[PDB]
Amino acid sequence: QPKDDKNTMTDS
Amino acid sequence: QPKDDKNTMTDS
Amino acid sequence: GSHMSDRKAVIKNADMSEDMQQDAVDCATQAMEKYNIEKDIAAYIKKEFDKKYNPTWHCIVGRNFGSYVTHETKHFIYFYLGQVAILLFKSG
Amino acid sequence: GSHMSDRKAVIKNADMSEDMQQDAVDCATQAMEKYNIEKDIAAYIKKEFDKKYNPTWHCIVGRNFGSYVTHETKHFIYFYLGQVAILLFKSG
Ligand SMILES: [Co+2]
Ligand SMILES: [Co+2]
Incomplete structure (x- = not known):
């Protein structure tokens, strides 16, 4: 994963 | 609202 | 699968050509066939769109969210696949 | 209010300076004081960040979503305010 990409996910 | 802005909302 | x-x-x-809209739906379909989790689905779509339609795309996938974003003309789609919403747009 | x-x-x-992180929290707080709906909260934050920290920002506010995005270095935050998640980043 590139340094300036981000992947987010909300909590349950 | 500018032409190339968008505002979204999920359905209930 | x-x-x-x-x-x-x-x-x-x-705000997108019919063909690119079809590709977005197809891409999201493929993503959801492979991945269960929203973040992984979003990642698959973003990466495919960067390859097919140039950087820089951003993808949000989920059942509850609002957004306010800015995109390059003719490079925006917001749609549902089943009960899941997908926001996909190009900026940068 | x-x-x-x-x-x-x-x-x-x-991926953000402590001061800008504080401003993001403050901005989101102000937005949520004024607006009930996620899309309006996101709009308030995006517009304020475009003014204070230059275009082009994008904001997602919600309780259920995943994302995969690309941002300019030092211009990304993902945080909760209460039970609501806020994604805010600069691209373009
Ligand atoms: Co299947
Ligand atoms: Co209040």
């Missing part, structure tokens, strides 16, 4: 082959695509808002 | 003055800020992921 086949559990998405019966899901309904509903375009909510698009 | 005061119902957010007891909400907890939890930073989940940031």
Whole structure:
């Protein structure tokens, strides 16, 4: 994963 | 609202 | 691998060519066939769109969210696949 | 107008200066004081960040979503204010 990409996910 | 802005909302 | 082959695509808002809209739906379908989690689905779509349609795309996938974003003309789609919403747009 | 003055800020992921992180929390607090709906909250934050920190920002506010995005270095934050998640980043 590139340094300036981000992947987010909300909590349950 | 500018032409190339968008505002979204999920359905209930 | 086949559990998405019966899901309904509903375009909510698009500023995008019909062909690119079709590709977005197809891409999201492929993503959801492979991945269960929203973040992984979003990652698959973003990466494919960067390859097919140039950087820089951004993808949000989920059942509850609002957004306010800015995109390059003709490079925006907001749609549902089944009960899951997908926001996909190009900026940068 | 005061119902957010007891909400907890939890930073989940940031690539951002401490001061700008504080401003993001403050901005989101102001937005949520004024607006009930996620899309309007997101709009308030995006517009304020475009003014204070230059275009082009994008904001997602919600309780259920995943994302995969690309941002300019030092211009990304993902955090909760109470039970609501806020994604805010600069691209373009
Ligand atoms: Co399947
Ligand atoms: Co209040």
